[PDB]
Ligand binder design. Structure first.
Ligand SMILES: O=S(=O)(O)C[C@@H](O)CNC1CCCCC1
Ligand SMILES: [Mg+2]
Ligand SMILES: [Mg+2]
Length: 536
């Protein structure tokens, strides 16, 4: 049996994360001061007689600084009051910010708040083109539209053209903030990534910065960073101990990248168990994916697929030695999950993730069959298989495992492929297909998404890619609509799904394949989030 020649780049990081011993003195000192700062900030939030603009700016700043997770109740109360008071006497900057904050928190504020800034045709008044803070906040708001907000159809184009025009002559750090926003909007960014940028590059350099908030943000970020490093060390040791790097050498060695993805799903300390469980799943399914894509024979993949469906250690017999390796590891991992959720009485929920993994593997095999037969399915058939091979139904399901408040009812909701989940999955599917078309086409994958699209509609590669981009935009509008109250499950269980979509936008930014090539997109984020602390 002739195996393919391995072509995955080695891990970028070596052993540098393998060992992290926390400085307890420093961590304790940080936590003590943060408690004081937190109380000071709580009082800023609860101050009476603040103007609307000031209140919104404060909330926005605390959110961008990445410390809003300390104040979920205070912020929710304040935003609810603003929503219900329904004010109208504002300028563009305040109106756009108000719209964005409320929509992001699920308050369905009417887009009619923008009508006073438009002519008779719903086009934004170009007389506003010299209002940079207005344009910036309009730009950010334009990304949180639903299908009911066609009033705002012009907002992105309008704000973009005039921010571009103004940017080179703007004062710092406003120039840098505008330039950054044009590359990466806030709503679609990974929260810890945007927080790292905002604290260090913008807020630290604002003449009018509040020193209490800045110090709070820096200490909180660096203290949470200590937790993250501890987690990654624990996961790095778990990975090293499995030693796939040598027993399964055809496979990617990307546990640090998997950790970054888990960190994007949630960064808060209370999701520590959830993060570690999630990264282990992302690592393990990555192995499976590599086995289907670039090592296993048709015969081997069949047995593997069947073995996964039956989920029984007695099935190791039918597998080739190398396949035995990952199959036992997978079965052990889920046993570990069950064990880990035992003392909480939440062991029984692990079955939901297992069923989703079975689904992923079934569709990996279908994908293999298509490749082997040279089949190019219609788009509808393509998606019926290829949506699950994003692993995103599986990852969202996994993300709930370590969340202590997640109930069977939450898993029931998720199992029905609700709209917001389907949207996130679609975004991952079409953005990856656009970014990876040319390489996959080179390797003879005639059932890649864009190829299926081209043949089905009889259109060019350019036209197919535009169609796929449209599908992503529709999906983002569906995500935004899915956050609106009343929500079908607690918002806590929607945010991971939102964050999976954000991970897509960030990993494939500028249509780069940051998936297959870690150095291309992800390496600087990992350094900024997990190697370098923020200087105080
Ligand atoms: O190439 S596949 O379609 O098999 C898988 C790919 O689409 C998705 N892989 C990662 C998952 C987590 C980070 C974002 C993308
Ligand atoms: Mg694959
Ligand atoms: Mg691809």
């Amino acid at each position: 049996i002739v195996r393919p020649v391995a072509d995955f780049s080695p891990s970028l990081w070596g052993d540098q994360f393998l060992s992290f011993s926390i400085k307890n003195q420093v961590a304790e000192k940080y936590a003590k001061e943060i408690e004081a700062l937190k109380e000071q900030t709580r009082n800023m939030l609860l101050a009476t007689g603040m103007k609307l603009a000031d209140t919104l700016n404060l909330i926005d700043t605390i959110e961008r600084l990445g410390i809003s997770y300390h104040f979920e109740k205070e912020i929710d109360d304040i935003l609810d009051q603003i929503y219900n008071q329904n004010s109208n006497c504002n300028d563009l900057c305040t109106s756009a910010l108000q719209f964005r904050l409320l929509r992001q928190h699920g308050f369905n504020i009417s887009p009619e708040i923008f009508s006073k800034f438009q002519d008779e045709n719903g086009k934004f008044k170009e007389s506003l083109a010299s209002d940079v803070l207005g344009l910036l906040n309009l730009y950010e708001a334009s990304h949180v539209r639903t299908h009911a907000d066609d009033i705002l159809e012009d907002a992105l184009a309008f704000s973009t053209i005039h921010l571009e025009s103004a940017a080179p002559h703007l004062k710092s750090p406003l120039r840098e903030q505008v330039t950054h926003a044009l590359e990466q909007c806030l709503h679609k960014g990974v929260p810890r990534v945007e927080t790292r940028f905002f604290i260090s590059s913008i807020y630290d350099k604002e003449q009018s910065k509040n020193n209490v908030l800045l110090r709070f943000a820096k200490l909180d970020f660096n203290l949470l960073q200590m937790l993250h490093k501890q987690e990654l060390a624990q996961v790095s040791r778990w990975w090293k101990d499995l030693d796939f790097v040598t027993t399964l050498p055809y496979a990617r060695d990307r546990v640090v990248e998997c950790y970054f993805w888990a960190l994007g799903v949630y960064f808060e300390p209370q999701y520590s168990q959830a993060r570690v469980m999630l990264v282990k799943t992302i690592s393990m399914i990555s192995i499976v994916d590599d086995t289907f894509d670039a090592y296993g024979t048709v015969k081997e993949l069949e047995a593997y697929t069947d073995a996964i469906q039956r989920w029984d250690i007695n099935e190791i017999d039918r597998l080739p030695d190398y396949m035995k390796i990952s199959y036992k590891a997978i079965l052990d991992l889920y046993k570990d999950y069950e064990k880990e959720l035992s003392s909480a009485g939440r062991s029984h929920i692990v079955c939901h993730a297992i069923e989703r993994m079975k689904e992923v593997v079934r569709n990996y095999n279908v994908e293999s069959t298509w490749f082997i037969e040279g089949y190019t399915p219609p788009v509808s058939e393509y998606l019926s298989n290829a949506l699950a091979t994003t692993t995103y139904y599986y990852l969202a399901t996994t993300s709930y495992l370590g969340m202590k408040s997640a109930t069977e009812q939450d898993f029931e909701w998720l199992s029905k492929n609700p709209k917001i989940l389907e949207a996130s999955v679609i975004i991952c599917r079409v953005i990856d297909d656009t970014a990876t078309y040319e390489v996959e086409k080179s390797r003879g994958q005639i059932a890649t998404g864009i190829e299926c699209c081209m043949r089905d509609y009889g259109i060019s590669t350019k036209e197919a890619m535009a169609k796929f981009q449209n599908m992503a935009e529709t999906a983002w509008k569906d995500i935004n609509e899915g956050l609106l109250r009343p929500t079908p499950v607690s918002t806590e269980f929607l945010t991971p799904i939102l964050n999976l979509a954000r991970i897509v936008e960030v990993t494939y930014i500028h249509n780069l394949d940051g998936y297959t090539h870690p150095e291309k997109v992800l390496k600087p984020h990992i350094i900024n989030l997990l190697v370098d602390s923020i200087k105080i």
